[PDB]
């Protein structure tokens, strides 16, 4: 009412678990466009002589204060809730394959924040370190690929053209094939 609205948030990610068509930043307008619309209500008596310092604004100070209090930490979620399983697939891959579809500034900040990890990782000097692919013992470097209906088509890795779904298969070397595991790919090598 005054922000009980995330009960509505709950459905946006429903298909979007491991069969994601696409995401929406949506539904956010009046849950946003009221919030400091109603600051004007919050400021109506903010340091006002309307009652000259008595009880009568403390019970609604709580309205003034709770109103924020819920807005923030839900609005933590709107990225944090969105940072979580995106970090997870962004663990499943680095920025080898970002999202199939100021969050980019926070992602770039998170990518710069992850640098610390990368510095010690692999060596003192640092390696974006393989954590999520090639438990392969490495074999000969130039043999092709197979998938299980991947989608997004971000394979930018050193190949002729792969067309990243099942039968994304061309003469693709090891440098190419270093992308993904469990987003519709690894029935096969």
């Amino acid at each position: 009412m005054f922000g009980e609205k995330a009960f509505d948030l709950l459905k946006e990610l429903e298909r979007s678990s491991q069969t994601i068509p696409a995401f929406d930043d949506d539904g956010v307008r009046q849950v946003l466009e009221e919030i400091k619309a109603i600051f004007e209500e919050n400021v109506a008596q903010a340091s006002s002589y309307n009652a000259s310092g008595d009880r009568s604004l403390w019970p609604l100070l709580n309205f003034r204060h709770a109103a924020l209090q819920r807005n923030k930490r839900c609005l933590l979620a709107y990225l944090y809730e969105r940072c979580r399983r995106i970090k997870a697939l962004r663990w499943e891959f680095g920025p080898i394959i970002p999202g199939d579809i100021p969050e980019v500034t926070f992602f770039n900040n998170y990518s710069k924040s992850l640098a610390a990890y990368m510095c010690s990782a692999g060596y003192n000097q640092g390696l974006p370190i393989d954590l999520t692919n090639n438990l392969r013992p490495p074999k000969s470097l130039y043999i092709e690929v197979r998938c299980m209906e991947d989608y997004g088509k971000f394979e930018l890795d050193d190949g002729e053209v792969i067309h990243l779904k099942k039968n994304s298969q061309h003469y693709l070397p090891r440098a190419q094939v270093e992308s993904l595991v469990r987003q519709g790919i690894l029935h096969h090598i």
Binding site: G3, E4, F7, W58, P59, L60, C74
Partner: protein
């Protein structure tokens, strides 16, 4: 700013009608206006908690009071009837009302009433051991909190299932 929940304003929004030690003044969202800024001590005086969450029970503003499920007639014999008593989904804020409120009332009797319900878990979830079958058999007699670890209760065993073998 709490031990959070997704419903963090379905936290202190349950309503009770505890009486007034005092007269009234302009509840705002009510029929208050240029109509009434004063009533009696004691009235159907509705209390969605968040405004009175730290508003000095000790101070003469409002009264010792209970919602009658939280009164002894349920609770004090729900600790006697702590055997196959049901909670359903009926008043879900019932592990957690008393984690806040029941002291705030200031009748210095009711906190102990609670746990001896939840003391039963040390001899309840002997039955809770395992998962036979489907995802929906009897999954509707929960609180807002026990369900989570109950799912988790399944969960470690569900993947303890794969600890065994290829299964």
């Amino acid at each position: 700013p709490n031990y959070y929940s997704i419903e963090d304003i379905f936290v202190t929004q349950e309503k009770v009608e505890c009486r007034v030690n005092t007269k009234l003044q302009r509840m705002g969202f009510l029929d208050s206006g240029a109509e009434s800024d004063d009533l009696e001590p004691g009235r159907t005086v509705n209390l969605p908690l968040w405004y009175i969450k730290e508003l000095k029970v000790n101070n003469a503003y409002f009264t010792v009071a209970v919602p009658d499920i939280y009164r002894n007639v349920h609770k004090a014999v729900c600790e006697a009837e702590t055997t196959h008593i049901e909670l359903g989904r009926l008043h879900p804020y019932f592990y957690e009302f008393g984690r806040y409120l029941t002291p705030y009332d200031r009748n210095h009797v009711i906190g102990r009433i609670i746990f001896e319900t939840l003391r039963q878990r040390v001899r309840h979830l002997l039955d809770i051991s395992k998962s036979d079958g489907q995802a929906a058999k009897a999954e509707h007699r929960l609180d807002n909190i026990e369900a989570k670890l109950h799912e988790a209760g399944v969960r470690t065993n569900s993947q303890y299932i794969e600890w065994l073998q290829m299964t």
